[PDB]
Amino acid sequence: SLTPFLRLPLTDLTGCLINHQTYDKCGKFEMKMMECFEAYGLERGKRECADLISDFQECVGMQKQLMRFHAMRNERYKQWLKGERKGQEFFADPPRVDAY
Amino acid sequence: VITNNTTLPEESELNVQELNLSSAALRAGAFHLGKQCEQANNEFMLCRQELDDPRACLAEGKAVTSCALDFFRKVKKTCHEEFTQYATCLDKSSGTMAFSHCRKTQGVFDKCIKDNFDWDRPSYGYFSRAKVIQSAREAPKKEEKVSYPDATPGLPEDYPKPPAKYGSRFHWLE
Amino acid sequence: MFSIIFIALLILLITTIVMFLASILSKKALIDREKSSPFECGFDPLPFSLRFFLITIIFLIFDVEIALILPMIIIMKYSNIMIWTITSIIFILILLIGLYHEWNQ
Amino acid sequence: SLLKRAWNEIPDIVGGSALALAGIVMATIGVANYYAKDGDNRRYKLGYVVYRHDDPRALKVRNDEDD
Amino acid sequence: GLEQIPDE
Amino acid sequence: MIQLMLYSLIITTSIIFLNMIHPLALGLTLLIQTIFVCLLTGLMTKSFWYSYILFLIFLGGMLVLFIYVTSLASNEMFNLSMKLTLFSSLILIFMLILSFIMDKTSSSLFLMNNDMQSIINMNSYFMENSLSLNKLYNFPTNFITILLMNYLLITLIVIVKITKL
Amino acid sequence: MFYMEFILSLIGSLLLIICVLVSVAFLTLLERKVLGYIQIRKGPNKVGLMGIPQPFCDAIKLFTKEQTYPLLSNYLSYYISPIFSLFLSLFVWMCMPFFVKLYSFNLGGLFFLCCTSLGVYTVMVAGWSSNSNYALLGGLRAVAQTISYEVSLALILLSFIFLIGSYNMIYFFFYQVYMWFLIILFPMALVWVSISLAETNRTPFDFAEGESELVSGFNVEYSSGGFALIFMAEYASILFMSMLFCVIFLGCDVFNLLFYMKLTFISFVFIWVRGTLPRFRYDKLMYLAWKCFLSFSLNYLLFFIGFKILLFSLL
Amino acid sequence: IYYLTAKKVKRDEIEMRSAQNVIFPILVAERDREFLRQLRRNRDEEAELMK
Amino acid sequence: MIMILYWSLPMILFILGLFCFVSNRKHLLSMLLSLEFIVLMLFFMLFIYLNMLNYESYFSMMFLTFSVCEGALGLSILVSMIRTHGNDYFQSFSI
Ligand SMILES: CCCCCCCCCCCCCCCCCC(=O)OC[C@H](COP(=O)([O-])OCC[N+](C)(C)C)OC(=O)CCCCCCCCCCCCCCCCC
């Protein structure tokens, strides 16, 4: 989060407006980043606290999971276009409707 | 995310006979199911809420499923036609399965249960309060404070402040 | 919502088909110079009005204000009661004081 | 007077202001009645809520009869 | 209904 | 699929919004874009509250000022061209058959709906449009909506001064 | 997902549209008949048997006459107003409280406010495209009164939603199982009648679409099918306001035949105030919509804020 | 009279919520078993596809 | 990648509305209507951002309030030149 220049009474309302702290899949990850930004500050927290930054961005940004999903779907279509996979076995056994 | 390092259970461990009843057969007879099966539901949901692990307390989930199956088999042995009529009136009564649309067959079902098993139906909001149980499973861990030995050190309040050596050390000053 | 799109497109399609068949069923006569003329009573023939524009602006300000009065029916059983009451009483009271002040001035 | 003039010209606004004052009074009455008892600890929780006996929240549960 | 439940 | 249909409709209405010049016709293109934007933001969300809020605020509340100003601005009627209608229909049928020949699972959005969530999620079963709107009326974010109502009153005070009445 | 839900939803919606349209035709018959009986004179008669196929005599005539245009060159903008008007009047009925499920509208009041907020849009394109100063004056006057009581209607229905605790229209049924809301909300009943005769252009709020100060506000150049679609859309709005009065104040009672008897009675009340009251002015209607009804709306909304807080502690 | 009607509606929805809380953990355990099984087949399918 | 497949279209239509905002072939009313077009695209992109988080969608009516006040401000600026510049200032291609 951005460090404001001035710490007046007028940052008290703006500060809580967006935050993963309200119930969320991994706000407990963000807290583990945010307290780290209390420890080293904002600028040393960019270097000394890089492992906890990437987990929160991985969780809520959903980057490598969606990239892995698109790698698994494009490889299946490449195998379909290259003739390795065809017919009724193009798609696997579907999950149950209440599985997830 | 699931890799080869994570230990998922085998499919033979997951091959458990399941409660395959419909919505009307689960909504009807629920108030006698919860009172009879309150020892395993609370422990299984405490396992699900505390650890938040799908692989943990699978034996508790199996115990919940087996207890529900035992209660429905006990209902099937004695009071079958009354429960079938109660579930039928509950499904044909309204869109959502609301208990207030027909109370005529609910009294017959509770009369059958009171005559056979001598069980009392609980109140309307008995199962929506807070449940306090003596769980045998130990709580996992207290949330420990993370240790940062090299933080950003500020000037302490107990640090003495003598006057500065040659003042400001600016051009032509002090 | 996907059924709502289908039924709204069906209502639009049915109304356009009914109007197209009405235009076919309408009696086609010779088109005229005076028949196409805009109607002014009898003999043949407006600037911007600021009062109606500030009426639309007052409607817009009160509409966006109503869009914040809209959520709090749901929140009343899922929030702090003192905070909810303080915000609701303050909200409608400042709205009433502003309405009465704009009435008096 | 002043209230006679407001009751003569604008009686619906006077009646609405009486209703709003009554609503504010019974809103404060409802807030005081909610916070006089343990209104923050509702009797009928949503979801499936369980507490073990070591928790401090398990000692604050309500054992009242259903109304 | 209850007829789905196998005998055990 | 219908998300891709709304993508195609928004693309077609945007390129005809770029093409046309008559101000009430751009206002009509905006009012028919707002419906598709409302539905398409309704596809990502748990419930359709904010689409309704955007609908009342933007279309029925605000754009009627734009429709009134653009109606009194232009004396003349629309010059309807069958070429632009044919080009819009051709690009629309092309983009719908392109969505037919494309896998919809990879093209679907990653944002979860109310039914795309987990079954064991406790918060989804409570009340529709409850936890998302909760922070509007709770400490300490209620000062923003109090400031918003004050901002709307101050906006009306600004507008009365700048139009000079 | 089970396909008979889609099939029965489609069948029920089309049956609703067909029955609403035939009830619009018979509502025009009822209005011409009992509106005559408001005075000494008789209603329609002498066509068919006892005047019953008189709206079909209207429909055969209006679908045969020459579709004239306010200008000869470009008139496609003249077409799009009765299409969208009848589309909104037949589309607003999907938020009717159906106990057998047709559409699970958990936010029905917002849908009603959306369709009412398009009512201004169809009357604005009705006014502008008809190329006449009378048409523009009537369109601006109708847009003025409908956005003036849009804010009031939103606040009144917003006060009503506090009673049932949610936006689901079927929740009006469960809170009316012991008594109707006509007992508790009688000044709200009079205010809601003044609201419902303002969004739909009727005689008490008729400076928009009257035959005295203007010859016709926005139907002045509309004829030969466009006037038929506009007339059917306005009478469907009357039927929707009668139903929405009968759901909120009178008990929803969707299945009982007494609910539809009361719906015909509230349509009779709409035609009863059609023959009685004179027409308001522009200045007096700006006084009514923004001061009296707005002050009553905010005040009695404060009353239900206090009452719903008082019952929340007691329950 | 509205207070009595709201009390009746409140006790009806509390009864429905208590029935939902009874039905819920069996369905949670069934979802748990199907979720673990489907994760196993998804891992096996990803392993055989990406060879 | 993620940007190419997800949320690429609001960027493209935002640049199209920006180019319609600043083109010399349009007029001031077209600038204001294209401005509310990019307001709609900004709402689309902001809602795609805000729905990665679960229960922070309440910010969507804050940006709506500010941008609607911007639009009413721009209309009241533009029609304030009616009594001064005349009714023909809406057809001005340059400022
Ligand atoms: C089955 C029923 C059969 C009979 C009825 C049949 C018809 C159905 C109902 C139709 C109703 C009429 C519809 C059209 C109305 C047209 C007239 C109209 O709009 O008039 C506007 C008029 C205009 O007000 P006005 O009359 O003051 O303004 C005109 C006078 N000048 C301009 C000079 C100021 O009335 C109102 O707006 C009144 C406000 C709303 C109603 C009152 C609510 C007040 C709050 C509740 C009571 C408060 C507590 C009181 C007790 C305690 C006091 C301390």
Token pair, residue C88, equals 């609701």
Query: Which residue has a Cα nearest atom 12 of ligand 1?
Result: G190
C/H touch flag: 3 or more CB pairs below 8 Å? no
Residue of G nearest to F130 (CA): G166
Question: Which helix or strand (DSSP H or E) is residue A25 part of?
Answer: none
DSSP C24-88: HHS------TTTTSPP-SSS------HHHHHHHHHHHHHHHHHHHHTTHHHHTTSS-HHHHHHHH
Q: CA dist G46 to G51, G52, G53, G62, Å?
A: 6, 9, 10, 20
* Rounded Cα distance, A26 and B143, in Å: 16
Ligand 1 centroid from CA C62, angstroms: 23
Residues of F with CB under 8 A from a CB of C: 2, 39, 42, 48-49, 53, 56-57, 60-62, 64-65, 68-69, 72, 126-127, 129-131, 133-134, 136-139, 142, 145-146, 148-150, 152-153, 155-156, 159-160, 163, 165
In this structure, chain F runs to a length of 165
DSSP chain B: ---SSS-PPPTTTT--------HHHHHTTHHHHHHHTHHHHHHHHHHHHHT--TTTTHHHHHHHHHHHHHHHHHHHHH-SHHHHHHHHHHHHH-SS--TTS--HHHHHHHHHHHHHT------TTSTTS-EEE--SSPP----PPPP-SS------TT---PPPTTTT--TT--
Contact at 8 Å (CB) between G38 and G275? yes
**Taking CB atoms and an 8 Å cutoff, what residues of chain D touch G296?**
12-13, 16
Residue (of G288, G108, G119, G294) closest to G209 by Cα position = G119
Contact at 8 Å (CB) between F52 and F40? no
Token pair, residue I95, equals 């400022």
Ligand 1 centroid from CA G292, angstroms: 9
β-strand D50-52 against B131-133: which pairing, if any? parallel
For residue G235, count CB atoms less than 10 angstroms from its CB and return exposed for 0-12, middle for 13-18, buried for 19 or more. Answer: buried
Token pair, residue D12, equals 């619906």
- What is the distance in angstroms between the Cα of F142 and the nearest Cα belonging to chain A? 8
Cross-chain residue pair G306–D17, CB shorter than 8 Å: no
SS3 A59: helix
**Taking CB atoms and an 8 Å cutoff, what residues of chain D touch F128?**
none
Contact at 8 Å (CB) between F136 and I64? no
Substitution target from C46, C49, C53 for chain I, most I beta carbons within 10 A: C53
- Residue among B11, B27, B44 minimizing CB distance to H19: B27
* Rounded Cα distance, D1 and C103, in Å: 21
* Rounded Cα distance, F144 and F130, in Å: 19
What technique determined this structure? cryo-EM
**Given resolution (angstroms):** 3.3
Question: Which helix or strand (DSSP H or E) is residue C20 part of?
Answer: helix C2-25
* Rounded Cα distance, I30 and H9, in Å: 53
Contact at 8 Å (CB) between C11 and G91? yes
SS3 G161: helix
Go through the domains of chain I in sequence order and give each one's CATH number.
Answer: 2-92 (1.10.287.3510)
Query: Residue G74 pairs with which residues in a beta bridge?
Result: none
User: HSE on the CB side for F93, CA within 13 Å?
Assistant: 5
Cross-chain residue pair A23–F131, CB shorter than 8 Å: yes
* Rounded Cα distance, G255 and G99, in Å: 8
* Rounded Cα distance, G30 and G207, in Å: 24
Ligand 1 centroid from CA G151, angstroms: 18
User: HSE on the CB side for F118, CA within 13 Å?
Assistant: 14
Terminal CA-to-CA distance of chain E, rounded, Å?
Answer: 16
Q: CA dist B136 to B133, F134, G225, I85, Å?
A: 9, 37, 78, 84
Q: Which of G149, G155, G190, G249 to probe ligand 1 with, by most ligand atoms within 8 A of CB?
A: G190
Q: Which of G194, G200, G273 to probe ligand 1 with, by most ligand atoms within 8 A of CB?
A: G194
* Rounded Cα distance, F156 and I16, in Å: 32
Q: Is B139 on the interface with A (CB under 8 A)?
A: no
Go through the domains of chain C in sequence order and give each one's CATH number.
Answer: 1-105 (1.20.58.1610)
Sign of the Cα pseudo-torsion (I3, I4, I10, I13, in order):
positive
Q: Which of D12, D14, D19, D21 to probe ligand 1 with, by most ligand atoms within 8 A of CB?
A: D12
Angle between helices G226-248 and G3-38 (to 10 degrees): 100
Separation of CA I62 from chain center: 15
